[PDB]
């Protein structure tokens, strides 16, 4: 067919939510003409925050660090666009950015 | 030194006679000392105080391109010499 490399890219505030996302859509889309070369996942980006705590005035001027790693999953499909759009009818949660792109 | 300080609590070291110069004795001596040791190093030239291990070493190289001493490592810098045969 005239495939579309569909890239459905899924970046998520945790790995957790998105894999669930990823999988189910793909399962849904697949079945059957949706044809996918397995999901590759780009580097987990990390956000660091160290803070000066305490308003010691006096007492230890010691400081504390919170982090948010952000997880990227990509699957590419050589698939039908309308079918893609047919399956694309999922309202999906937050914490899981899912982008879909049609390059080749 | 010109420096007012620049020297510690215990450390003490005396002077050498090695120099930039050009000297009849040095040159001539060098010719007679560069054969002399069985091993010849730039450092021993320095140690016989006439010319330091630096340019004396050049003295050795420029006596050893005259073969007077045998350049050992198969390259430069930390080459060394033995007296020639």
């Amino acid at each position: 067919q005239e495939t579309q490399r569909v890239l459905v890219k899924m970046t998520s505030r945790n790995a957790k939510a998105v894999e669930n996302v990823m999988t189910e859509l793909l399962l849904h889309a697949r079945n059957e003409k949706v044809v996918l070369r397995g999901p590759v996942r780009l580097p987990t980006r990390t956000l660091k925050v160290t803070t000066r705590k305490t308003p010691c005035g006096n007492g230890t001027n010691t400081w504390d660090t919170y982090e948010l790693k952000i997880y990227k999953r990509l699957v590419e499909l050589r698939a039908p666009t309308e079918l893609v759009k047919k399956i694309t009818s999922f309202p999906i949660d937050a914490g899981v950015d899912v982008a879909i792109t049609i390059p080749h | 030194k010109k420096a007012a300080k620049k020297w510690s609590k215990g450390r003490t070291r005396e002077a050498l006679q090695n120099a930039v110069m050009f000297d009849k004795e040095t040159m001539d001596k060098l010719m007679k000392e560069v054969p002399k040791y069985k091993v010849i190093t730039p450092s021993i030239i320095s140690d016989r105080l006439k010319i330091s291990v630096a340019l004396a070493g050049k003295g050795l190289q420029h006596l050893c391109r005259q073969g007077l001493i045998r350049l050992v490592s198969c390259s430069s810098k930390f080459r060394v010499y033995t007296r020639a045969a």
């Binding site: - | 350049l71 490592s73 198969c74 390259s75």
Partner: protein, 149 residues
């Protein structure tokens, strides 16, 4: 087969290829220059007066290897660290005029080519000549083995 630029020590070879541009009188300095700071990092600068050849040798060394190496790359291969003063011990600055000269000159020397009008990559001829040079220098050493095998 043999030893090309991929196989040869510039320690003999750039020191000779420097001379290939010297000895032959092919390119030398540009009009704007011939004094040479090390680069923005230092006064004391090229004891070797042949720096620009050496440079060319080295820009050339770059250009066959990293085909398509832009202006900004040449700044980086330039390298160095700086002891500023009672201050940090941190890395140094690459003077671009001359960088740009080197780029202008090896392409005029036709050893460099401005790949895709940009990042330089070698002339064919350059590298055969380099390999040729490599062999000539290689064999007669002031080290150990084989001018007598």
């Amino acid at each position: 087969k043999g030893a090309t630029l991929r196989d040869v020590h510039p320690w003999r070879w750039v020191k000779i290829c420097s001379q290939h541009f010297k000895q032959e009188g092919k390119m030398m300095v540009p009009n704007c220059a011939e004094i040479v700071k090390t680069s923005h990092g230092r006064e004391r600068a090229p004891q070797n007066p042949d720096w620009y050849y050496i440079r060319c040798a080295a820009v050339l060394r770059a250009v066959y290897l990293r085909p398509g190496v832009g202006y900004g790359g040449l700044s980086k291969r330039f390298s160095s660290k700086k002891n500023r003063g009672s201050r940090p011990e941190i890395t140094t600055r690459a003077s671009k005029g001359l960088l740009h000269w080197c780029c202008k000159s090896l392409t005029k020397l036709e050893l460099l080519e401005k790949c895709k009008g940009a990042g330089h990559r070698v002339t064919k001829l350059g590298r055969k000549v380099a390999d040729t040079i490599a062999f000539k220098i290689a064999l007669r050493k002031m080290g150990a083995e084989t001018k007598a095998k």
